[PDB]
Design a protein around this ligand. Sequence first.
Ligand code: BCB
Ligand SMILES: C/C=C1/c2cc3[nH]c4c(c3C)C(=O)[C@H](C(=O)OC)c4c3nc(cc4[nH]c(cc(n2)[C@@H]1C)c(C(C)=O)c4C)[C@@H](C)[C@@H]3CCC(=O)OC/C=C(\C)CCC[C@H](C)CCC[C@H](C)CCCC(C)C
Ligand SMILES: C/C=C1/c2cc3[nH]c4c(c3C)C(=O)[C@H](C(=O)OC)c4c3nc(cc4[nH]c(cc(n2)[C@@H]1C)c(C(C)=O)c4C)[C@@H](C)[C@@H]3CCC(=O)OC/C=C(\C)CCC[C@H](C)CCC[C@H](C)CCCC(C)C
Ligand SMILES: COC1=C(OC)C(=O)C(C/C=C(\C)CC/C=C(\C)CC/C=C(\C)CC/C=C(\C)CC/C=C(\C)CC/C=C(\C)CC/C=C(\C)CCC=C(C)C)=C(C)C1=O
Ligand SMILES: CC(C)=CCC/C(C)=C/CC/C(C)=C/CC/C(C)=C/CC/C(C)=C/CC/C(C)=C/CC/C(C)=C/CC1=C(C)C(=O)c2ccccc2C1=O
Ligand code: HEC
Ligand SMILES: CC(C)=CCC/C(C)=C/C=C/C(C)=C/C=C/C(C)=C/C=C\C=C(C)\C=C\C=C(/C)CC/C=C(\C)CCCC(C)C
Ligand SMILES: [Fe+3]
Ligand SMILES: [Mg+2]
Lengths: 50, 50, 260, 50, 50, 331, 331, 273
Amino acid sequence: SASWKLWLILDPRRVLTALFIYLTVIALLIHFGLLSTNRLNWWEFQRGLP
Amino acid sequence: SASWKLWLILDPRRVLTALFIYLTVIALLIHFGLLSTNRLNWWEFQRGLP
Amino acid sequence: MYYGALANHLDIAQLAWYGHWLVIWTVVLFYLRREDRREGYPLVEPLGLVKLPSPDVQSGELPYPKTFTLYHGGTVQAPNPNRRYETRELKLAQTDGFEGAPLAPTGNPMVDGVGPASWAERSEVVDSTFEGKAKIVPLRAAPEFYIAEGDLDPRGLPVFGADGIEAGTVTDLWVDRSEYYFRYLEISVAGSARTALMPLGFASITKDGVKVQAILASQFANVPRLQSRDQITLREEDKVSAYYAGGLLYATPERAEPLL
Amino acid sequence: SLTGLTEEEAKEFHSVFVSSMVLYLATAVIVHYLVWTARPWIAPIPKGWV
Amino acid sequence: SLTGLTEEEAKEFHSVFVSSMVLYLATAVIVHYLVWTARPWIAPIPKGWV
Amino acid sequence: ADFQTIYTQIQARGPDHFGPSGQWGDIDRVGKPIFIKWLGRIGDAQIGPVYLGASGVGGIAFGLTAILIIGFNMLAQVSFDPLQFFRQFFWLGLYPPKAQYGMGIPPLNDGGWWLMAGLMMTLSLGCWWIRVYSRARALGLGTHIAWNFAMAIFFVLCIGFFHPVLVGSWSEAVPFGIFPHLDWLTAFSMRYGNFYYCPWHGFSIGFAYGCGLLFAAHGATILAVARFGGDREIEQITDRGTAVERAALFWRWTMGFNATIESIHRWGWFFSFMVMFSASVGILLTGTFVDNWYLWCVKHGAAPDYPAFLPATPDPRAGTFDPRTLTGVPQ
Amino acid sequence: CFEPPPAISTQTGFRGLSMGEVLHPATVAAKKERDAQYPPALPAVKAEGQPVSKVYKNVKVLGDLTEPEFLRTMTAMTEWVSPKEGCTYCHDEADLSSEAKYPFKVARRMLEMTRHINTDWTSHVAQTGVTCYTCHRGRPVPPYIRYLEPRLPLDNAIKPTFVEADNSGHVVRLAKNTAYSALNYDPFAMFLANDKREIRFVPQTALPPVGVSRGMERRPLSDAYATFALMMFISDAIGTNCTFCHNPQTFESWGNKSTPQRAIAWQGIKMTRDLNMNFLSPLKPVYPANRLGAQGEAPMADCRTCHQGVTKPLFGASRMKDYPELGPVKA
Amino acid sequence: ALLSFERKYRVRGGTLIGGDLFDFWVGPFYVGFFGVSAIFFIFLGVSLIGYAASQGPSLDPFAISINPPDLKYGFAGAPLLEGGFWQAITVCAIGAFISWQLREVEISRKLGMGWHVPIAFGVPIFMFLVLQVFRPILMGGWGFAFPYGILSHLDWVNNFGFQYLNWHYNPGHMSSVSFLFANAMALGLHGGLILSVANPGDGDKVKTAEHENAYFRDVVGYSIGALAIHRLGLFLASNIFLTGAFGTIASGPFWTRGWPEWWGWWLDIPFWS
Ligand code: BCB
Ligand SMILES: C/C=C1/c2cc3[nH]c4c(c3C)C(=O)[C@H](C(=O)OC)c4c3nc(cc4[nH]c(cc(n2)[C@@H]1C)c(C(C)=O)c4C)[C@@H](C)[C@@H]3CCC(=O)OC/C=C(\C)CCC[C@H](C)CCC[C@H](C)CCCC(C)C
Ligand SMILES: C/C=C1/c2cc3[nH]c4c(c3C)C(=O)[C@H](C(=O)OC)c4c3nc(cc4[nH]c(cc(n2)[C@@H]1C)c(C(C)=O)c4C)[C@@H](C)[C@@H]3CCC(=O)OC/C=C(\C)CCC[C@H](C)CCC[C@H](C)CCCC(C)C
Ligand SMILES: COC1=C(OC)C(=O)C(C/C=C(\C)CC/C=C(\C)CC/C=C(\C)CC/C=C(\C)CC/C=C(\C)CC/C=C(\C)CC/C=C(\C)CCC=C(C)C)=C(C)C1=O
Ligand SMILES: CC(C)=CCC/C(C)=C/CC/C(C)=C/CC/C(C)=C/CC/C(C)=C/CC/C(C)=C/CC/C(C)=C/CC1=C(C)C(=O)c2ccccc2C1=O
Ligand code: HEC
Ligand SMILES: CC(C)=CCC/C(C)=C/C=C/C(C)=C/C=C/C(C)=C/C=C\C=C(C)\C=C\C=C(/C)CC/C=C(\C)CCCC(C)C
Ligand SMILES: [Fe+3]
Ligand SMILES: [Mg+2]
């Protein structure tokens, strides 16, 4: 496989920074979105159940 | 095993500064998110249960 | 009964309103307009009917002159007694007897330097940096200045006139060393052994070449000449810019005519 | 090289990058299984659902 | 190199960086266990939760 | 079109040179200049170096403290929830006291934090004014900018501090917040009866529109003579070229009078200064000497009146409540 | 974020003052369709027999009626309040005289309240009047009720999200109860639950009077904010803008500066305060715990409860002639 | 009657229409065909304002109000006392503004200048057209336009704003206000900087463009430059009206609710409730 030649053109530092920011944003969206739901909020006392 | 070569291109100072800021933002988010709950708030008198 | 009352129908805000108007109009008429009269005054009436005060006395509308002490040397006054009179023998004839009547060039206004081709009687000195070097210089004489990386280098480009005819070749850029800003293109004009400066504002530059709406190709030959090769005086800058500006109205007769 | 790396630097970085990405994804898979054991988030089709 | 670190500076920085990162993560693990003893933050599935 | 007046196509680069030396503080001119390319299209590409100085540090320290107080109280307003802080930011605010305490220092929970933030911002503005003034002095320049800035700061003090003093209540002051300080605009206008009828509101707006007109006209004028070197305004002031002769003639032929390349800047300074001066006078008059600007205009015969379109409807509460209860505490 | 043209515009003020309603036709049509669900009046019945407080055992409000008319009233009430549950919502299946179920007692007080509205508040409801459907819209719980703290969503049949019920949502709960403004006040609890506060805050003289204008003798500016919040709420609840009732040139003035709708709105404010103080709040001990607020208070009514975003409830649909037993009551 | 440097610039040509017919000066004023039309519209419009004011209820200068027709009249010509005078004065104002702009074009052609000033003057003309013509066309009548009076057009602005319950929340308004404040501040800074450089103090030397760059690089870490500050001033001043026009034209034709509710697009995103 010649996939490694990607790093001759794609600048590993740019890719690492982009992945760092991108995955952080996704993880923050998921954690805080789950905390905005009654069903899947694991911090608060259980709400929204009869 | 050649991971140390990362510091030949990625500028230890930049990574240290970014990690400092990033871990600080994450820690503030978590501490303040916990303080916004009744169940896991440790500063205030206990709320959310009789 | 009320705060702010001065009589039955006089209150503080009412008086402050007129005080505000007094402040505004005293500043405007007593100070700002006097400042506005530090150039071009006293006014002249070449075709006047009555006698005005002599131009060399402080006639009443004139502010008392202030002194600018120049950074690199002497002093200038404002109003400037040395710039008070203009002596050039403009090549212009009256189209009608009164001052409000426009003048008409007596031939080749761009070369003569009248109308939009007029240049001011600036000092014949090279504008300088705060370190004392000539401010505006070609890149051949300022190797420490260069085009920013990845920006279009115009040297070697063909220069076309307003009529689409090729007029010359860009040979150099002239940079303002105080401002770090390109201000002129030097053009080797085809058909002579002669270079002409052109303000970068008259140039539309692409990768194909530069186009000049201001003047025809053949008129590049008559651009005013720099006395020195690698420096330019303030009056020379005025002359060179005014040549192309005059071409905006005079390059062809049609440019001086109305639509309807 | 358009990114300043030598070919062997490109290959060393590529090997470490792929190993790290795969390890991250594999631990994500395991973690998702564990979280499922805590909260089975895709509920079965409810009774009236169509 | 692009960062100014020599080969040996890069190796020594890598070693200390990895050791610091591992120690930080390990104390985070221990601290999370202690906090769990203080607050068991992932409650078991409540009765009517689906 | 002179495309140079729109943007810079061919940017120039040169030596990294120290600017003109100041009488002091060259030691505190710090930073390696950086050159960002898209900025050089619309202006100068160079960022830095920046001067530190003592007054700059003071401005930063007081301003960061005030920002910290405001932001923390905003965060407390959403009970420290970060996602909700992000969502609700524009609606959040640190408020001056809602109860009437006069000019007494209010409790932390009802205006004390607002007061501390206001003091910190005032001190940061004071330090930054010192920086503006003393940098002008250090470089051998006049202090015109600092006095324009002083007028702006004075207006800030009028709306945050001086009017509350003059009427005797902290509750009248501006809250910190994106939408909340606009809410204050409307509430303050209503309390004093339609600021559209305050003459100094009118003066301040006249000069603000005049700043719009003057900067549009002067910027367009300088761009229009940019091919004659009009942008080199200092040299034109000292040795007037054809650029400013053409500018003066354009305005003279348009409206019968004109400025000079120096005096148009005096006009601009004056108009910007008068925005803040008129605003300050209006705020200092409001409440202290005028209670209802619309009724003040009616008293002085200036307010227009209009026929009713739908039938005119008398006050259904006329003579049923004490008029002192409108603005005064009953007991 | 976009409403396609054209808008519908009315003129409520003198020409050139840009005063009047601005409406989206699709919104109007949707509200018209919603409100047209008003059940038609039940067919009239012959009013002959002996009065119902001879045949029946536990009639305390509608005693003057006869069995056919009284039964028709009950059929209308079950259509208006509990169409899904039917007669069993209020009544014991076997003993129709039994008042064991709390909706029975509430509905008796509601009959008295509706008669009071239709008799003593014609200055607001005019000859349109109200029925149970005006607020209930065919539900036991009216879609828009109020407590001492604002709640989301506005329609209480919709289950709130986590944030809408969480502390971190507090500011949003304020904003969406005052037409999304950032005003930091709950104007319902301040002004419409009772009549303790004065809505008016604008001075009625040009100059500040001695004794009400300095320090602790002044009302705080928070009152201006609170009234602005109330006015935003009213505009949203009635589905109009400020120029429906005001010439904003002077909000405080009447005569040619206010519309007849402003006088009607004052009567509405009085009526809402009266309904909350005398009919809805004193019902607290009758309700179960799940109908009460955070402070344990009974649910109340505001302008939105009847109007539901329309300047006239149900666009002025009336049943006053068809059900005279709901008012006006001839003494 | 001439500035001491003026005579060489007073040449024929550059007119858009009229040629040598109106190509002359009266005192300092250049006339031209559009100077003639500007004087026509100015005299007619001011005289119509004078007569229409004379027939209104108050002759106090600040209480005079010439109002557009009722909404019922739509786009029809109104009786003169009931909006027809407003229509005539509106037409005169448009003719005067456009004549003034075109005379500026002729003057700048005569002087070999760029047309930046009449083009910039186009922006307030466009805003006037948005207020008095385009939005009234979308709303369906001349009655939606503002009246002519020192305080009455403020009443129109006020009531228009409160027709949308808080005009401060209009996003176009927020952009427009930000540009207005930025422009006033930038004009203060620019006037102050030029004056400080040219007027250092008592017997001190006029400084240089390097001092201009150094001052702002010291104070804020950035200097935009001498030409660029004029470009920026024009940009900010223009964007006051260029971005305000969007809020204005949207209010009613594109948005009938309160402006604070428009921010529900952000507040009501389901992800964060
Ligand atoms: C309660 C209602 C409010 C309101 C209602 C409002 C509306 C409805 C509108 C604005 C608009 C605007 N508002 Mg807002 N306003 C603004 C500022 C602004 C401006 C930035 C902006 C544009 C003004 C304009 O278009 O003029 C127009 C000026 C023109 C057209 C000048 C034309 C000049 C003409 C071409 C030439 C005339 C020449 C003379 C006749 C000649 C004179 C001759 C001489 C010789 C005497 C501030 C800074 C504030 C504050 C501090 O709160 C505020 C509060 C309010 N506004 C209140 C909240 N305002 C407008 C906007 O853009 O909104 C998005 C707009 O439509
Ligand atoms: C009519 C004339 C006017 C006028 C005039 C003049 N105006 C001047 C001058 C003159 C003459 C100067 O000389 C001076 C200056 O130097 O110019 C370069 C200045 C200035 N006008 C500023 C802002 C301004 N002018 C406004 C209005 C008018 N001006 C009116 C229109 C408005 C409006 C309307 O909103 C604004 C916002 C600053 C940029 C500057 C002061 C900086 C300061 O005092 O700093 C004080 C220092 C601090 C507050 C510390 C800040 C620390 C960090 C960066 C901030 C926190 C960061 C942290 C990460 C937290 C994040 C959250 C946080 C962002 C929230
Ligand atoms: C964004 C850019 C802006 C900008 C820009 C520029 N601005 C310019 C130029 C540029 C570039 C010029 O080149 C030109 C000029 O020469 O400058 C000296 C001009 C000018 N900007 C004037 C007024 C001005 N600019 C405003 C706003 C901005 N300017 C914004 C900020 C405002 C506001 C906001 O109120 C005002 C009042 C005049 C002084 C002058 C026009 C002369 C005219 O047009 O002559 C011709 C017309 C007359 C002299 C009078 C016409 C009278 C009619 C017939 C009868 C009255 C009708 C009217 C509708 C009644 C209104 C009543 C009222 C109570 C409601
Ligand atoms: C009346 O005219 C005026 C205005 O118009 C209204 C103004 O706006 C202004 C500016 C601003 C205001 C009045 C509003 C804010 C002002 C307030 C609250 C009062 C004035 C306060 C200030 C100007 C700054 C406040 C700063 C502090 C209290 C901290 C002081 C600490 C400092 C300066 C650093 C500590 C260092 C030392 C004490 C010694 C060493 C100092 C140095 C080496 C450098 C100091 C340099 C200088 C130039 C003083 C002035 C000065 C003015 O005269
Ligand atoms: C026979 C016949 C038809 C005759 C008709 C002749 C004719 C057309 C007459 C016209 C008469 C009329 C209508 C006159 C009215 C003229 C007008 C509109 C006057 C308004 C003046 C006002 C209020 C201007 C507001 C802006 C203002 C405060 C300007 C003052 C500051 C000045 C002078 C700015 C102009 C100006 C600017 C903007 C520069 O940048 C510049 C740069 C370098 C040198 C000079 C200047 C300069 O003078
Ligand atoms: C709640 C909203 C009710 C529904 C639904 C129905 N009824 Fe009712 N009913 C209600 C009240 C509050 C009262 C008391 C009236 C009073 O003035 O005191 C009644 C009374 C009756 C009676 C009289 C009982 C008696 O004493 O004999 C009858 C016979 C009766 N209602 C019948 C009835 C029927 C048939 C209904 C279904 C269509 C019905 N009611 C609905 C309140 C409510
Ligand atoms: C006499 C005595 C005893 C005392 C006098 C004290 C004194 C002089 C007080 C003066 C008060 C003054 C002048 C107040 C003036 C206030 C004014 C005019 C405010 C106006 C507008 C304010 C606005 C728009 C503020 C917006 C602020 C923000 C959006 C801040 C946002 C902050 C953050 C995101 C930081 C988050 C930080 C994180 C840790 C939570
Ligand atoms: Fe300038
Ligand atoms: Mg919470």
